Scaffold this active site. Structure first.
Site, PDB file in Angstrom:
ATOM      1  N   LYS A 184       0.744  -1.309  -0.008  1.00  0.00           N
ATOM      2  CA  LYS A 184       0.002   0.047   0.169  1.00  0.00           C
ATOM      3  C   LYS A 184       1.028   1.210  -0.070  1.00  0.00           C
ATOM      4  CE  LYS A 184      -4.464   1.609   0.061  1.00  0.00           C
ATOM      5  NZ  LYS A 184      -5.460   1.330  -0.342  1.00  0.00           N
ATOM      6  N   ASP A 244      -7.271   4.899  -3.753  1.00  0.00           N
ATOM      7  CA  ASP A 244      -7.868   4.849  -2.329  1.00  0.00           C
ATOM      8  C   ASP A 244      -8.663   6.094  -2.021  1.00  0.00           C
ATOM      9  OD1 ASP A 244      -9.001   3.364  -0.226  1.00  0.00           O
ATOM     10  OD2 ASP A 244      -7.092   3.006   0.485  1.00  0.00           O
TER      11      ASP A 244
END
Lengths: 460, 460, 460, 460
Positions: free
Chosen positions: D114, D154
Site C-alpha cells: 500500500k 483509495d
C-alpha cells in the site's frame, strides 16, 4: 502532527539545532532560511527492508535493515553502517542528520545518511556473520552505487563485515566499484582508513584542548577523562599520554579504569593496546584489570560512571555513547574543577547537562569557564579519510601514507578556520564572555547546506 | 539535395571549411580525407524535444529544446547550452561543428556538440527560470550521462540555470555525477571556471596581439576595439588596459562606448565592474554612460557599430556575436589603419568581409598587412577550464587555483605550438607574405579529427 | 518566429487543421482547447541520427535517419518507417501529425510518430539493403522499445527490410520483443497484415463510396479513378470490380492505364496481380502495356495524370501520393461530373483543390454534390491490423485469420460510428446541404487526443 | 528489546491474526508454520520519500510519501495509494498486511502492499494537485514497475490524481505501460471499476443469511444500517433497495441520516446520485438533509453514530472508517436486535466490539445472533477488477463489459467456494453454534501465502 511518529533522539537533535539557529544573526539577516529548516529535517529517502538469513543451527532468522539517505545537496550519500541490536529508524535518522552537517562543516564533498540493522554480531560465529552480510547486501544493492550510496563502517561493522558485504556486492552487481568504505589490501581500500575513526577522534581531542587553552598549555599536569574502549579510545589514550597527559579513565561500558594514584601513576601504551585487543576478542575488561600489573596501575569500580570518582579531572572527555553524561554527573564534573567538557561522541551530553553547561559558562566569565564541545564539531577525521578512500577508489590507484596524511592535516585545518571565522562574531555576542561552540558549528554547517539546496532548487 | 533543409549559418561554415581545406597540401597528399569531409558534416545525433512548463500567471508554456551531439571521435560530447530566443537547429549545428575542431585544435580530448532552447531568460522571474530548467532537465536527462553528454553554459545559461538543472538531474537520476559544467561551491564545481570565459578570451586576445607584433610591441600606444558586454569584453578590457592598452570600444549591442578623447583618455577597471554589475541587473549601458564620470570618460553614439567612429583604432576586436563586421564596416576598419582583424567570437566576421580581409592581406606584403583572427583559433580557455572541471569531477576532489592555472597556461601553449607547427608550411606558401590563420587552423583541427574517425572505423 | 524552420507540408496540414477547428462549435463551447492546439503541434521527441554503411563496391555511404515521436497521450508511439530518397523532417513531422489523429479517430490504443531515412532501395542489391538496415537499426535501437517505439512499414520498407531490422535488433538488444510490425512466419508476425496495406485501402474505398451513395447504389455502372500500381492500388482494384466495378485508372506515377473503351471494357484481376508482380520486380508499366492481352484493354498516355482523360469517371480515387490532384485537375473532375473525391492518400488533394471542392459542394445542394474524402478519414485499415499484431506479440501467441478479421470489421465499425456521431451537428449545419467530412474527422480526433493530454497533465 | 517502534493499528491486526491462528487446528497439525508467522509480519520493503512541490501562492510545500511492499509471494506488489492527512507508516503497514490475505483469499495472482502520502486533497485547486502528483511520481518512479509495483487508488486518489500520476510516469520512463490502476477508458481502459465493491458486502450478507437460517430468512423486508458516503456505501444502498430492502442510514463523519418512518422510508437512487455529486465536492451531508425532500424524510443526528438511534435494524454495514463501532455501540447493536454485522472497511469494529460480537455469535442459534463479518471477507471484487485491468494492460487490448463482468463473477464464486471449503477443517464449529467466519478467512489466506513463501524458499 500527531500522525507523524515520535523519534525522541531525532526530535531532540532538531530542537537543539532550531534553538541554536534561532538565537543568531543569520536568521534575522536571511529569514528565508527558516523555510529551509522545513526541508532539511525530512530525509530524502528512507528504505527499510527485511533480511532473511540462515543461522548455524539451520534455522531462519529475520532482521530489519535500514538505509537513511538524508541529504545529498553537497555530494553523494555518505554514511556508515551500524550492526547493533538497538538500531531503529530514530537512531539512524538522528545520526544521518548529524552526518550532513559534519560533512558540511569540515569542508568535504559527500552528503549525509546512515545505514544499519538490528543484527547483533555479539555471540555470532564467522559463518553467521558471513551469511547475514550476504543476505543483507542482496536487499541493499538495489539502492547503492558509487555515486548513489557509499555505506561506511560504525559500531558493529568491522573489517570482516565490510569484506563480506563487498564480496557479495561484487558477486551480484558484477561491478567492482568504490561503493563501500573500510576496505584494505585484499579488497583494494586505503591506508589509515580502517583506523581513521580513532585517528580523527584523537585529532579533534588534542585540537580541542589546544584551542581550549588557546595553545597556552600542552597536556602537562592534565588529567584526561577518556571514555570507551577498543577503537577510538585506544588512539585517544596513546596520543594523550605523549604530552605527559595523565590518563585516569577508560570506562568501557560499566567498569571504570581509574588510577588509584590519581596524582602520579598513569597508563602505558602497551596496556592500552592490550585493552583494545581484549575488546576485539569480544570480552569486558575483567581479566584485564584483574592482572597484577593492571591491578596495581588502576582500581576497579564497576557499575558507576567515572564522573563519580574523577579524582579532580582536568578535562572531561566522554566518548562512550549518546547521553553518557547526566545532569547530576555534569554538576559533579563542574564541581570537580573541569572547564572543558570535550565530549567525543554524538549527543553524548544530556540535553539538561548541555543547558547547565551553557548556563554555567555564561555565568563563569573568564578563562575558568566550562567550554562546551558538540559532537559533530569533534570526531570527524574518519569521514575525511573515507572521502579520500573513495577519491582514490575513483582514480584507480592507491595513495601513499605520506600523501594521505598530507591531504589530511592540510584539509580539516582550512575547515577549522572556516568554522571559527563563521563563528567570529555572528551569534553568541561573547562581549567579554566565552563564546559558544554549538552556536559556532550549527550555523557554520547549516548555512552551507541551505545554500546548496537553495542553489539547486530544493527550497525557494 | 533540396530534400535536405537549408541551414544558412551551418552552410556558410561548411563552405568556409571546404574552401580552406581544398587549397591545402594535406588534400593532395591524402585525397582520402575528401570523403571524410562527407562524414564530419553529418551530426552523430540530433535530439529535439518539447519542454512544457508553468509560468508565473499559472499558464502552460511550450518551448523546444535541442541537443546536437555532433562528433565524439576524440572524447565524450562536450558543448554548452544556449537559452536564447533565437536558437534553432541551424545555429546549434554550426556552433557544434565549430566546437569539434575547437576542442581538437587545442589539445583537449573532449568531443563536439551544443545544446539549448528558444527560452528567453529576459523578463523572467526566478521561479519561471526554475520551473523551465526542471522541465528541460527531465526531457534532456533521458539523453545525457557523465560519459555520454556533459552540457556547459553559454549566452543565457548563467550559474543559476546550471544550478537548477543540476538539482533536477540529481533528483530524477539519483546519481550526482559530473554531468554538467559551470558549478561551484554549493554544487561541487571548480575554481577559475566561473571566470573562465573572460579568462580564456583575454588570454587569447593578448596572445593574438603578441603574435601580431611577434613580441615587438605590447599594448602600449594601441587602441583596442573590444565589443560586447559579456565576460568576453570584461576580462578582455581588464587585461588589455594593463599593458597601456587604451580602450576605445565597449559597444554592448547598439550603444557604442567610445572615448571622446581617443588620444589620451581611457577606461578604468572600476567602471568596467560597474558595467558588469548593471549587465547582471539586465540593463544596457544606459544609466551607466549618463553618469558624470562615465559622461566625461566616453561619448555615446547608439544605433551604430563602433567601426564608423573607431577614432583610428589600432587593433579591432569584434566580440559581440556572429556577423558583427559587415563589408563596408570591414573596409572602414582597413582604411582606419588596422592591420589586425581580431574577431573574438564565432563567425563574427561576415563571409564577404573575411574574403576582403584575405584579399587585402595578400596584397599588403609586409608587417603592414591586415592579419586575420578566426574565432575557433581563439576563445579556448573556457573550454579548457570546463575540461579540467570534468577531470576533477571524475577524481572526486577539488584542485587548487595554483594547480588549475598551472594545468592551464601549460596546456594550450603546447596546443598553440601544435597549431603553428602544423601550419608551418602546409598550404599558404607565405613566400614573403603574411600567412593565413583560418587555413592553418582548419587543417590543424581537421587532420586530428579525421585521423580519429579513420582509426575508429567511422570512414574508410 | 522566423527562428523556427519552415516546413511546407507540416505547415499546410497545421493550417488546414486550425482552419477546420476554428469554424466549429467545439472552440466556442470550450475555448481552453485552443491552447491545446499549441501543445499538439510540437512533437514530444524528434531524433535525427547519422547512418554509416558499406556499399557493394566497398565504399562508405552516409545517410540520415529520422524518428519523430509526435504524441503518446493515447498509447505508445506507433508509426511506420519510410525509406525514400525524398524523406526529411518536414515530411515525417506531417505524417506523424496525421498519424496521431488517425490512431485516435479509429478507436485505437496507439500514439503517433513516423520514422524513416533518405535511403533509396531502388537499384540496391540485397547486401546493400542488409548492411544499411543493420547500421540503421543500431543507431535507432538506442531509442526504441516495446513500450517506447514500435516502428512499422511504409513506402520503401518491405518485408525484407523489416526482417533485417528485426534481426539486428534481436542481435544487439538480446530481447526478441514485439518492437516492430510487418513480420511473418520466420519472425513471428501475424496473418492479414501481409496484405493489410491493400486490405484497409479497399475496405475504406468501398465503405466511402457506399456512404457516398448511402447504400443506394453498389458499383454497378460506376467508373473508378484508382491511382498507383500494385499493393494498395491492386487490392483496391480487386474488390471494386466485384460489384460490377468498372476500372478506368491504374496510373502508377506517369503512365495512365485508362481503358480505351470506357463504356464496356474493364480490367481483370490476374492482370492486376501481374501489375503488382511487375512493381515488385522494380519495373514501371511499360512492357505491361506492350503485351497484346493488355494492349487491347487500355490505352497508354504517359506524362499526364488520369484526370485529363478520365472518360467521365464516376468516383475519383487519387491514391498515389500527396498533392496528386491539382486545382485545374480538380476543376476537370468537376466538369467531368464526379461527385465523390475519394482520395485515399495523405494530403493527396491540393489545398486549392480542397477549397474548390468545399466551395462547389456547398454550392451544389443535393445528392449531386461533390462529397469530400480526407485521407485520415480514409485508410486506417492497416493501422488496426498492425495494432492487433503488436497485441498478439504481447500475448506470446498467434491469432487465427478468422480471429483477426473478426477483431477487425467489428472494430473500426464502432469507430466509424464514433467518428460520424461526434460530427452529429457539431458545426457544419448541413441544413439541406451535404455535410463536410474533414470537419467531422478533425474534431473527432482532436477532442480525444486533447482530452487525453489534459487528463494526463500535458496542458492545463 | 523495545527498539521496535509502536504501530498500534498494525499491532491490533497482528494480534488478531495470531489469536486466530493459535485457536485452531492448523498450528497443531503443522507447527512449522509458526516461523512463517514471524517472517510474513516484516514488510519486506518500506520506502519513505520526501515530496517537495510548489503551491498556488508560489511557496514550497514538503510532504512524505510511503510505499509499503509487504509481500510478493503470490504475484507483483499490488496495493492502493491513499492521499489523506492522516497517513503514516503504521496505517499503510496495516492496510498492506490486510491486502496480502485479501488478494490471497480471493484467488488472485497479485501481492500485497500500500502507498500514499499525508497530502490533503481537500481545499486544493486542480493546479496544486497536479503539481503534487508530478513531484510524487518523480520521487516514486524508481521503485515502480509493471512487474515491480502497480499502485492503485483509495481514499484521496480519485480519477484526476491517477491521471496526473500516469502522465508524469509516462514522460519520466518514456514508457507506456499498465503500471498504475484506475486509468481512463481511452488510456488503459477500466470497465465496471467503481461499481464492483459496493454490492460485495450485501452479497456476503445474503449468502450468510441464506446459510445460517437453514434457508428460513431472506433480504426481503430488512433494515440496513449502512454507514459512510460514496463508493461502497452508495452501491450497498442501491443493491438493498433493488432487491426490495429498505435503507435507513447513510451516515458520514459528521452526523447521521435516519428515516423518520423507520418502517417505510428509504433513499431514492436519484437522491443517492445527488449525494455522490455533493460528496465529490467534499461537502457535508448535513446541508443535504436540509433539502426539502430530505428534510421531510430524514432527521439529522450531528456528532452521533446512527446505529444507536435507528433502533431495531436488521443489518449493520459500517463502511465509513476503521474502529467506528465501539464496545458500548456493540452492545447497543445487541439491544437493537441486529442479526448480521458486516464491515465495508478493514478493522471496522473495535477489538472489544469484535470480542463481544463473537461471544454473542455462539448464542441465538438460527437467525438473530449478530454475526461478525470482517472487511477482507466482504470487501473484494473491486481489487479483482483492478487485477483484470493489469491483465488488460498486459494483453495490449481492451476487454468488453460482458467479458470483465463474467471474469469477476467467476473470480468471486471461486473465492467464496475456496473460503468456505477450508471452513470446519481448522475452525471449531461445535454442534450448530454458528461457526466463526473471521477465523475461517484468516486461515484460508494465511495457509496459501505461507505455502507460497515456503515453496519459494522464504522461510524453512
Amino acid at each position: 502532527m500527531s500522525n507523524l511518529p515520535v523519534e525522541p533522539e531525532f526530535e531532540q537533535a532538531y530542537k537543539e539545532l532550531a534553538s541554536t539557529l534561532e538565537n543568531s544573526t543569520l536568521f534575522q539577516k536571511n529569514p528565508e532560511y527558516r523555510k529551509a529548516l522545513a526541508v532539511v529535517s525530512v530525509p530524502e529517502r528512507v528504505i527499510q527492508f527485511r533480511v532473511v538469513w540462515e543461522n548455524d543451527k539451520g534455522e531462519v532468522q529475520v532482521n530489519r535493515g535500514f538505509r537513511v539517505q538524508f541529504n545529498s545537496a553537497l555530494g553523494p550519500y555518505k554514511g556508515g553502517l551500524r550492526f547493533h541490536p538497538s538500531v531503529n529508524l530514530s537512531i539512524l535518522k538522528f545520526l544521518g542528520f548529524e552526518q550532513i552537517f559534519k560533512n558540511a562543516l569540515t569542508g568535504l564533498n559527500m552528503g549525509g545518511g546512515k545505514g544499519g540493522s538490528d543484527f547483533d554480531p555479539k555471540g555470532k560465529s564467522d559463518s553467521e556473520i558471513r551469511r547475514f552480510c550476504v543476505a543483507f547486501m542482496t536487499e541493499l544493492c538495489r539502492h547503492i552505487g558509487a555515486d548513489t550510496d557509499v555505506p561506511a563502517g560504525d559500531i558493529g561493522v568491522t573489517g570482516r563485515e565490510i569484506g563480506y558485504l563487498f564480496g557479495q556486492y561484487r558477486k551480484l552487481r558484477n561491478s567492482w566499484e568504490g561503493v563501500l568504505t573500510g576496505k584494505g589490501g585484499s579488497w583494494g581500500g586505503s591506508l589509515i582508513r580502517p583506523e581513521a575513526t580513532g585517528y580523527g577522534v584523537v585529532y579533534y581531542v588534542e585540537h580541542m584542548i589546544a584551542h581550549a587553552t588557546n595553545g597556552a598549555e600542552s597536556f602537562a599536569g592534565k588529567r584526561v577523562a577518556i571514555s570507551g574502549s577498543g577503537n577510538v579510545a585506544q588512539y585517544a589514550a596513546l596520543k594523550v599520554i605523549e604530552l605527559g597527559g595523565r590518563v585516569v579513565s577508560l570506562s568501557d561500558s560499566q567498569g571504570s579504569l581509574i588510577v588509584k594514584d590519581t596524582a602520579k601513576d598513569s597508563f602505558t601504551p602497551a596496556e592500552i593496546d592490550a585493552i583494545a585487543a581484549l575488546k576485539v576478542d569480544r570480552k569486558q575488561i575483567a581479566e584485564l584489570v584483574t592482572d597484577a600489573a593492571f591491578a596495581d596501575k588502576f582500581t576497579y569500580l564497576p557499575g558507576q560512571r567515572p564522573w563519580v570518582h574523577v579524582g579532580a579531572v582536568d578535562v572531561a572527555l566522554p566518548s562512550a555513547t549518546q547521553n553518557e553524561v547526566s545532569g547530576e554527573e555534569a554538576q559533579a564534573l563542574i564541581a570537580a574543577g573541569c572547564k572543558f567538557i570535550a565530549e567525543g561522541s554524538n549527543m553524548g551530553c544530556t540535553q539538561a547537562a548541555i543547558d547547565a553547561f551553557e548556563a554555567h559558562r555564561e555565568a563563569n566569565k573568564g578563562a575558568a569557564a566550562i567550554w562546551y564541545a558538540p559532537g559533530k564539531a569533534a570526531n570527524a577525521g574518519g569521514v575525511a579519510v573515507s572521502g579520500l578512500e573513495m577519491a582514490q577508489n575513483s582514480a584507480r590507484l592507491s595513495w601513499t601514507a605520506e600523501e594521505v596524511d598530507a591531504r589530511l592535516k592540510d584539509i580539516m585545518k582550512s575547515c577549522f578556520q572556516n568554522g571559527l571565522d563563521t563563528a567570529k562574531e555572528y551569534a553568541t555576542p561573547a562581549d567579554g564572555i566565552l563564546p559558544s561552540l554549538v552556536t559556532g558549528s550549527n550555523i557554520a554547517g547549516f548555512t552551507k547546506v541551505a545554500a546548496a539546496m537553495k542553489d539547486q532548487g530544493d527550497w525557494w
